[PDB]
Design a binder for this molecule. Sequence first.
Ligand SMILES: CC(=O)SCCNC(=O)CCNC(=O)[C@H](O)C(C)(C)COP(=O)(O)OP(=O)(O)OC[C@H]1O[C@@H](n2cnc3c(N)ncnc32)[C@H](O)[C@@H]1OP(=O)(O)O
Ligand SMILES: CC(=O)SCCNC(=O)CCNC(=O)[C@H](O)C(C)(C)COP(=O)(O)OP(=O)(O)OC[C@H]1O[C@@H](n2cnc3c(N)ncnc32)[C@H](O)[C@@H]1OP(=O)(O)O
Ligand SMILES: [Cl-]
Ligand SMILES: [Cl-]
Lengths: 264, 266
Amino acid sequence: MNDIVASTQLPNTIKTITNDLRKLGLKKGMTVIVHSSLSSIGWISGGAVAVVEALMEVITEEGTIIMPTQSSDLSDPKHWSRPPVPEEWWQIIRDNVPAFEPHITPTRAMGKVVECFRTYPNVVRSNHPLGSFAAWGRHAEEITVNQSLSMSLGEESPLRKIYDLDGYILLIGVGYDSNTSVGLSEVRSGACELIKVGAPIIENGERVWKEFVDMDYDSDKFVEIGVEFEQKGTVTMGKIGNAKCRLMKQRDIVDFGTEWFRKK
Amino acid sequence: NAMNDIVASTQLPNTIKTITNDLRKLGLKKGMTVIVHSSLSSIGWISGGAVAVVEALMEVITEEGTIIMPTQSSDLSDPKHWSRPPVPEEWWQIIRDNVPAFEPHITPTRAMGKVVECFRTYPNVVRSNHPLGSFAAWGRHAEEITVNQSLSMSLGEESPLRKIYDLDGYILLIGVGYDSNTSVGLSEVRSGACELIKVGAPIIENGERVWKEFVDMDYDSDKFVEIGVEFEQKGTVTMGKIGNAKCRLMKQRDIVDFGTEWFRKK
Ligand SMILES: CC(=O)SCCNC(=O)CCNC(=O)[C@H](O)C(C)(C)COP(=O)(O)OP(=O)(O)OC[C@H]1O[C@@H](n2cnc3c(N)ncnc32)[C@H](O)[C@@H]1OP(=O)(O)O
Ligand SMILES: CC(=O)SCCNC(=O)CCNC(=O)[C@H](O)C(C)(C)COP(=O)(O)OP(=O)(O)OC[C@H]1O[C@@H](n2cnc3c(N)ncnc32)[C@H](O)[C@@H]1OP(=O)(O)O
Ligand SMILES: [Cl-]
Ligand SMILES: [Cl-]
């Protein structure tokens, strides 16, 4: 916090952030999926809330804002790597981990900006226990509704609805390893193996541990993809405060990513 | 490596069930009024994290009891007085003109913890109207406790601390000490322990952002830990473990009355 204060000349505000966003190319009526690091911007008067109102101010109710709202805490611990756990636990976890509930389940590894956004009124969340998304504005409903359990990031997912709407991805202080849209590139190219997975859901107002199948998604290659993608000079770059940001068409990068994965 | 440590220091995973046992053996029970302060990590590894702890509390207290937690948002306060991290005066007036108004369902808390962030978003959980020192509550007296908080004297005789007092309710500390024990700020108000300062914050007055100036105590938890140590000598605090976390259950009137008397004796 001390550092963030020191590295900032004047405070970022809803107004400054809003300028920065417009200079960069965000505009009224656009569809955008947003990924962010709050600290990278520098000190902000209002933190997470300011970044959310600024996005809202620029895009407006006639535009649409989406953000990933992933809750991997709820996943089968068999496959747990980041931190791992003893096999005696596994079956206890499956039998006791609380079911997914849109309004309730916290995100993990998404950031304060996402935590703040998902609790806003009129912001709606998709129905996936592990790979949900939240959306606001004009196509909120259409984007978040009827996500399939299997293939969370596939052709029945919000990623594809953003694709069909020819929308944009915005990266604030983060690189391609956070660019969830490229998962759809994975699916479309068959980049990863399938695995049997599970999660807890409310089936008939009744907790149930549901097994189903998904890709072993891997953002390991995303950064590489992004570097080679940017050689085409189709990404807009500029600062929000101190943060290096990026604005691109989602179709652009998803299509590049599909072709890239195949070329291997 | 923290998540790693927490896992390593845990024998079997904490769950809604285990946490609920521990609460009951400690003395939490149906129909009780309780203000809860916590460190999630202190418990050890929990299947479901914050959500587990929240459900466990509801499971024990039930809709016939009441749960309260502080939902403070000091981010929104006049930067003149900022100490923890400070900011150049050139900013100060900009901050007052631009920092977003408080909104109960919107404004994140600062320094309260994941358990509070999770709690305040639960349905049926209602939050008081203060832009800096709000509280959130659930169950039988949720409404009565959180309603009509005065601007000035946030933690005073028009605050939720007092409503908890009148109800003869409890304080629960999970993995945290008396420096987190917000109730004692009533003791401060009752005893006149701190100076009064002209403060401000941004509110929605008529669907309209307004910077409001008003007056409060310069509240100081610096002495709480000392107060707590001397308080516990009377042996009226119940102690026990939730997972790995050393916990404490006491009657709020007990500690607030001791605290009022303590502060005066000086
Ligand atoms: C394959 C896939 O799809 S990947 C999943 C998609 N992922 C995403 O979209 C998330 C992408 N973002 C990231 O990965 C980021 O690196 C993060 C969020 C993980 C980490 O970024 P951070 O800035 O460290 O975290 P975050 O954005 O939550 O903001 C919190 C930090 O901002 C800082 N902060 C607090 N208040 C303020 C303020 N007023 N002004 C500026 N900074 C502040 C604090 O440092 C805080 O950290 P703390 O929680 O340790 O106090
Ligand atoms: C006088 C007054 O009015 S002041 C007091 C008002 N405030 C309060 O009552 C707050 C009381 N609590 C405190 O003071 C504590 O020190 C805190 C909350 C500030 C810090 O406690 P922590 O345990 O570090 O954090 P918190 O309670 O948010 O728990 C989240 C942490 O638990 C850990 N965690 C995450 N998942 C799990 C899990 N399944 N199991 C266990 N731990 C987990 C993580 O470290 C997380 O922190 P990070 O993810 O940011 O690294
Ligand atoms: Cl668009
Ligand atoms: Cl008195």
